[PDB]
């Protein structure tokens, strides 16, 4: 246990028997956020559970030596699962021929991409990602249909456009079930 100077960090770290090979480590910050890490026979990270201030966790399990592993993000009402690589993390939601990918870079840059394998020029879905607004805009038949704003509060919000795609209408609703995300990609 090593507490930082500003009395804000509680680094619950445990050594195996001597002080060379790490085993487990938990660091709790002031803003209710923790980063649990587990290690292997070598000393490279095996699991990495990171908790944000709002309670949404980003859990990494089964980290291999090459830098890969299993990825899953737990949220209020639904979870997003995927894979981590030494490049970036991808979280995948699939509905029919449409696959939605959420990308989290090693620098924290969140990216969202969409792909539809249908070859029809009408029903195929395409998306454009806005970095500043953090909204994925789904386009169908060269007209905008839905807006997918990914809030900094770790939630997915959908706002629908009009019949011509000129502007969004009504109010933007929040997603509380995984089936809702699948319904948006149909």
């Amino acid at each position, epitope marked *: 246990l090593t507490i930082s100077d500003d009395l804000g960090q509680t680094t619950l770290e445990v050594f195996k028997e001597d002080g060379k090979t790490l085993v487990s480590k938990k660091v709790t910050s002031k803003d209710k956020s923790s980063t649990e890490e587990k290690f292997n026979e070598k000393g490279e990270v095996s699991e990495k559970i990171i908790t944000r201030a709002d*309670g*949404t*966790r980003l859990e990494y399990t089964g980290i291999k030596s090459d830098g890969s592993g299993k990825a*899953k993000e*737990v*949220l*209020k*009402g*639904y*979870v997003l*699962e995927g894979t981590l690589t030494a490049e970036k993390t991808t979280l995948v939601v699939k509905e029919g021929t449409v696959t939605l990918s959420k990308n989290i870079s090693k620098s924290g840059e969140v990216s969202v991409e969409l792909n539809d394998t249908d070859s029809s020029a009408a029903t195929k879905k395409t998306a454009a990602w806005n970095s500043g607004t953090s909204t994925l805009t789904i386009t169908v038949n060269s007209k905008k249909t839905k807006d997918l704003v990914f809030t900094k509060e770790n939630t997915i919000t959908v706002q629908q456009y009009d019949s011509n795609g000129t502007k969004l209408e009504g109010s933007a*609703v929040e997603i*509380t*079930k*995984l*089936d*809702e995300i*699948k*319904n948006a990609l149909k």
Partner: antibody
Amino acid sequence: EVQLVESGGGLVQPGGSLRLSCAASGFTFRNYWMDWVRQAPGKGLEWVANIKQDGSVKYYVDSVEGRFTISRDNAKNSLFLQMNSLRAEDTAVYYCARDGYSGYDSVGFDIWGQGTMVTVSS
Amino acid sequence: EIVLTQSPGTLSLSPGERATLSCRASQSVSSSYLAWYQQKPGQAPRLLISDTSSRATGIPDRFSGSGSGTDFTLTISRLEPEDFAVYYCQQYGSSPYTFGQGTKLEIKR
């Protein structure tokens, strides 16, 4: 204490209609999804309908579509299932059930009620 | 639509034995969207396990869920006379939320 009370079932003729009611107490009704589950005599469980917290989103099985409607009243802490154009195969004990998956922890159907036995026959 | 198959049909065990209940899925079900339920006759079903690991606030340690992907298992370590109900495997990821056909745990005498 968390519990659910079901009412509205009975014996009706084929092609008739009846309304189910589920009274909720002991928990925040506005914060949970809700579901309808039926079970035919001597058969397994079959999910029927699902509703969002605010009632905007409703999902149904292929069989009951266009005939059953699920609604709720957050203020009255109640929930309903209108069942029009009843067929004989709809004879089952309909269990009102709380979703449970209302937060970060993933939970299955937390709460089940006693159920109401609806019988569709001539 | 995901279809869940439960094996065996009925399992005849004596109290105090260990019961292994397996549930097969037609596709790959995420480990975060599977549940186990118990229904004693004449009563409503009760939620036993969620997330394949969580015991749902009041179930003893005898009941234990495991498995991933296609095959999921629920094991009762030391059977008790009140444990010989019908058990159901359910997924709640994508609609329709389907249940298994059910396994009747019967006391073997």
